[PDB]
Design a protein around this ligand. Structure first.
Ligand SMILES: Cc1cc2nc3c(=O)[nH]c(=O)nc-3n(C[C@H](O)[C@H](O)[C@H](O)COP(=O)(O)O)c2cc1C
Length: 383
């Protein structure tokens, strides 16, 4: 329990903050007074393709339908209306008791350069897993994905971060999330990136590795390991049961296996940039594999990759450095969730949690002062 504000005392570059901001313009108005703060809006970008217009002008917001967040359907994906469309449908309904503020007069609508991209405003689409990829193959949805991203790219100069995308088969384990390792995948991503660019917006691929959050039975079917930092602490009882039934026990990664993941991160980043992406974001949050190394609950290792703040941060920072070298610091961002407890991370109950994340922020600032500043740090807010 606590605040992410500590990061601003350490890292001096752009910071994207996400969590419960759409219904709190009064909070946003204060936050964007800081000249390097951007705001990610998740659930309300799902439900409002023209969210940026509505934020600028202080318009009512479309309610979101959580039941279709992960359903294999166009409904709840590409059929939420723009405000003028909604008025034609007689919707004038919208979110209840919400008092909108026109935020057009604030830094939210001031231009900012992120990486190589000239953003025209600071409302960012954060990564949103929608589970509409095709199985087998983890292929971006050929029916609706281009339309979905095109709708949400509609305001010129919008930064879009894609839903988490698996860097390899071993990195995955959900059948209906997309990957970025194969040619059939990249054929569809190219179409998505083209459409976003045709709308004068920008796109960054979130690179995803599941670790203990993967489904051990899916991995077992595909001849893959069930991976984490350690082999003596498990995500939850269901996952423990699944691993036992699939005869696929959680496996503590060897140093060579870590190296192989780094190789796959580099290849996935290269694939993304080749297909037209503006950059990549490393998912080191929400209790996935990198987070499993950062967190002392999940990381009980006694080698170079656990047992101290520096050791726990080593995998995340190795991935950062490998990507910076491969594609350039201006095309790399990093996502963190210091207070998260999702997927059995520790959050603020771990007294050393701020130190762990302060260390990572400090190492990023150190690299920046030496000439290699990441495009951004993206923080999950405990809101
Ligand atoms: C349906 C859904 C899918 C999400 N998928 C991802 C994801 O793939 N990667 C990630 O880092 N965060 C993901 N998040 C977290 C969001 O990026 C973001 O932090 C959150 O939506 C912000 O809170 P808000 O919905 O109140 O704006 C997801 C959130 C939701 C609701």
């Amino acid at each position: 329990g606590g605040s992410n504000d500590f990061v601003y005392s350490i890292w001096k570059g752009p910071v994207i903050r996400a969590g419960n901001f759409a219904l709190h313009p009064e909070v946003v108005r204060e936050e964007v007074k800081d000249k390097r703060t951007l705001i990610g809006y998740g659930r309300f970008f799902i439900s409002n393709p023209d969210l940026v217009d509505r934020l600028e002008k202080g318009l009512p917001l479309n309610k979101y339908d959580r039941d279709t967040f992960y359903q294999m359907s166009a409904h709840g994906y590409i059929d939420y209306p723009t405000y003028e469309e909604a008025l034609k449908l007689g919707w004038g309904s919208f979110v209840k008791d919400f008092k909108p503020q026109a935020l057009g007069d604030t830094n939210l609508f001031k231009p900012i350069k992120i990486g190589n991209n000239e953003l025209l405003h600071r409302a960012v689409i954060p990564p949103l897993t929608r589970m509409r990829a095709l199985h087998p193959g983890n292929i971006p949805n050929r029916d609706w994905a281009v339309e979905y991203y095109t709708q949400r790219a509609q305001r010129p100069g919008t930064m879009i971060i894609t839903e988490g995308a698996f860097i390899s088969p071993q990195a995955g384990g959900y059948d209906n999330a997309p990957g970025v390792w194969s040619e059939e995948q990249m054929v569809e991503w190219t179409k998505i990136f083209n459409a976003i660019h045709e709308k004068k917006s920008f796109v960054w691929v979130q690179l995803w590795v599941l670790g203990w959050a993967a489904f051990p039975d899916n991995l077992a079917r595909d001849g893959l390991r069930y991976d984490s930092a350690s082999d003596n602490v498990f995500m939850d009882a269901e996952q423990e049961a699944k691993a036992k039934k699939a005869n696929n026990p959680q496996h503590s990664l060897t140093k060579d296996e870590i190296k192989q993941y780094i190789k796959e991160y580099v290849q996935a980043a290269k694939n993304s940039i080749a297909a037209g992406a503006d950059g990549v974001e490393i998912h080191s949050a929400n209790g996935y594999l990198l987070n499993q190394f950062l967190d002392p609950h999940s990381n009980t290792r006694t080698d170079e990759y656990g047992g101290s703040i520096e050791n726990r941060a080593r995998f995340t920072l190795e991935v950062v450095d490998a990507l910076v070298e491969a594609i350039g610091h201006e095309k790399v961002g990093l996502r963190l969730s210091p207070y998260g407890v999702f997927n059995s991370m520790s959050g603020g109950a771990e007294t050393g949690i701020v130190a762990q994340y302060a260390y990572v922020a400090g190492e990023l600032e150190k690299r920046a002062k030496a000439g290699k500043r990441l495009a951004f740090v993206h923080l999950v807010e405990p809101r």
